[PDB]
Design a protein around this ligand. Sequence first.
Ligand SMILES: C[S@@+](CC[C@H](N)C(=O)[O-])C[C@H]1O[C@@H](n2cnc3c(N)ncnc32)[C@H](O)[C@@H]1O
Length: 180
Amino acid sequence: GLRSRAWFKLDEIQQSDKLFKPGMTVVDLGAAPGGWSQYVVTQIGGKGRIIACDLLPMDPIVGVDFLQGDFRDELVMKALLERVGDSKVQVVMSDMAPNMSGTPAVDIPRAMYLVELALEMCRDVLAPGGSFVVKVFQGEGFDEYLREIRSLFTKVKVRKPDSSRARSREVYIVATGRKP
Ligand SMILES: C[S@@+](CC[C@H](N)C(=O)[O-])C[C@H]1O[C@@H](n2cnc3c(N)ncnc32)[C@H](O)[C@@H]1O
């Protein structure tokens, strides 16, 4: 197809939640191969920009400052913050997912650690009034994580994009209005 399933999932979320506007600065976590950043550039336009990160390398995209590295490493976090600089960040988007073993009691904790790191980054860099979109899996830790997100944002919705495989346990938490 012309675009990836991931690109279509974000397009569906943009349609339901209107997260991306012209000129915004966006952080893209777990960006490879680049569908979400590709999609967001069409919305924020040439004057907006994205600071992206993934363990894997990916094709460059004009307007996207991409840093290959392990988001769990504080050194990588520091380098991402050097790319954000004093730019106000209006949206943090995370599609990070760990390598899956196939065993829930192992995969869920692995995944939950990554989304907790994404939320912590929201606390530090997401501007007041900003948004967060994050891939989360159903099951252990979901309730507590949604609660943590609801305490940091004004409105929170749980989305299951039509393009998201009904067989997959993923959902996308879409939070808006980051609190002061
Ligand atoms: C679902 S794919 C992302 C697809 C992306 N949204 C797109 O549109 O192309 C998830 C990605 O998360 C990344 N990931 C997982 N753990 C990570 C970590 N510790 N640091 C950075 N990226 C990580 C992977 O390497 C994998 O590329």
